[PDB]
Design a protein around this ligand. Structure first.
Ligand SMILES: O=C(N[C@H](c1ccccc1O)P(=O)(O)O)c1csc2ccccc12
Ligand SMILES: [Zn+2]
Ligand SMILES: [Zn+2]
Ligand SMILES: [Zn+2]
Length: 231
């Protein structure tokens, strides 16, 4: 049902309708001779769309916009990047060029700048302390605390009970931590517990990469992170 990394030619983007007015977007990026899948979110807000995260790169992000115009045909007026790494902000210049207002927390914008990555135009206030939540159009943005990165945000669509955890949440088939250079391994399980406490009603949980699931993805991620902690 859900597109897997094998079924998407590099450069092409798939959309997957999660619930009413909620899609994920799936793209792949070759990297070090391996191919990785990557997820973002699209949320309908009246007759406009809110975009969550780029499709990992200029060419992928351009194809994302073209696929949205093709299948949904509503304008992407705003976009939020959930942390500063290239798979979340790579392509922000393309969004900006297309007239999309791009947003991130000031923590994310700063870290993107230090990394030399593309930098969202707008700063999201009210997200600087663990447990902070703000509404942003049809979603709630939540800062659970440092985890995959110190700045990661998670996104919840209350109308559809969809939780988008970004790269702070692992898919079930990932049993080892992979890249954690910018992570807070010490705070990560506590941050995940805050997600569980704040969204106990979530019906669908979308990880930053790979297959969606339920709230079981959270304790699975904690297990992976604690195992890596004890490596
Ligand atoms: O895509 C993965 N890493 C993301 C990433 C990698 C390189 C540069 C920027 C960037 O953003 P990330 O660290 O930001 O999540 C990833 C690492 S192992 C694995 C296994 C399955 C699917 C994906 C991955
Ligand atoms: Zn990352
Ligand atoms: Zn603006
Ligand atoms: Zn990622």
């Amino acid at each position: 049902e859900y597109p897997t990394v094998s079924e998407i030619p590099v450069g092409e983007v798939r959309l997957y309708q999660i619930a009413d007015g909620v899609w994920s977007h799936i793209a792949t990026q070759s990297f070090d001779g391996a191919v990785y899948p990557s997820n973002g979110l699209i949320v309908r807000d009246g007759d406009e769309l809110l975009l969550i995260d780029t499709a990992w790169g200029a060419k992928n992000t351009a194809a994302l916009l073209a696929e949205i115009e093709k299948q949904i045909g509503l304008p992407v007026t705003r976009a939020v990047s959930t942390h500063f790494h290239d798979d979340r902000v790579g392509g922000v210049d393309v969004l900006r060029a297309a007239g999309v207002a791009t947003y991130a927390s000031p923590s994310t914008r700063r870290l993107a700048e230090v990394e030399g990555n593309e930098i969202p135009t707008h700063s999201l206030e009210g997200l600087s302390s663990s447990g902070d939540a703000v509404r942003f159009g049809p979603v709630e943005l939540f800062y659970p605390g440092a985890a995959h990165s110190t700045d990661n945000l998670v996104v919840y669509v209350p109308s559809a009970s969809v939780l988008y955890g970004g790269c702070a949440i692992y898919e079930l088939s990932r049993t080892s931590a992979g890249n954690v250079a910018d992570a807070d391994l010490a705070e990560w399980p506590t941050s995940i517990e805050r997600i569980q406490q704040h969204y106990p009603e979530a019906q669908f949980v979308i990880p930053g990469h790979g297959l969606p699931g339920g709230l079981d993805l959270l304790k699975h991620t904690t297990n992976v992170v604690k195992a890596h902690t004890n490596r």
